[PDB]
């Protein structure tokens, strides 16, 4: 059901793993069929697995890793810091995710902008 | 006015500084007079400087520091990872803040729970 704190840490860390290897399909499957995503938060929310899949396929020679432990709540929520290394540029990002009673991402917000870009 | 990305990084980092030295008053002043706070996110939102002041005075022998750079958006939003060290326990936390046109925290959400506790 709704992921407990420990379960959030697990799903979210796994997410970074998926993004890291670039397994698009596995990514999309982690999301609820109608999940929404704002990455970067504020411009603009995409909806559903088809658009999410297009988004990730669009983004993924890319590597990502946790730069801190996953922070989790008890109401199916979580946040985590991580970094993606593309091109020789690097991007620090923090994601906030809300899971549903099925353990799948309902919403995800990515926080970052040029100020978190390096190279 | 509304803090630009760079300005968010500055205000938020400063916030950690304030929490670190324990300057309660300075903390409260960073918040808007009617700001709300959920720390930990989900149990339950407090409102206004009087309650916020009581909250911080309640929480603050305490030290805190950034464990990663501040992630900022362009719509007055931001998130940052940090750690607080009390008792010999440690707590990893991620905060998300929204600032107003006056550069003061309108809302703040703290993400963490026992799973982020150490000692």
Swiss-Prot record, chains A, B:
Pfam families: SnoaL_2
Active site per the UniProt annotation: 15, 39
Keyword Transferase: no
UniProt KW keywords: Isomerase, Lipid metabolism, Steroid metabolism
Reactions the enzyme catalyzes: a 3-oxo-Delta(5)-steroid = a 3-oxo-Delta(4)-steroid
Leading EC class: isomerase
Effect of residue 119 to A: Slightly reduces activity and reduces protein stability
UniProt: substrate binding residues: 95
Keyword set includes Lyase: no
EC number(s) given by UniProt: 5.3.3.1
Single GO MF descriptor: steroid Delta-isomerase activity
Effect caused by changing residue 117 to A: Slightly reduces activity and reduces protein stability
GO biological process: steroid metabolic process
Swiss-Prot/TrEMBL induction comment: By steroids.
Assembly and oligomerization: Homodimer.
Descriptive protein name: Steroid Delta-isomerase
Native source organism of the sequence: Pseudomonas putida
Organism lineage string: Bacteria, Pseudomonadati, Pseudomonadota, Gammaproteobacteria, Pseudomonadales
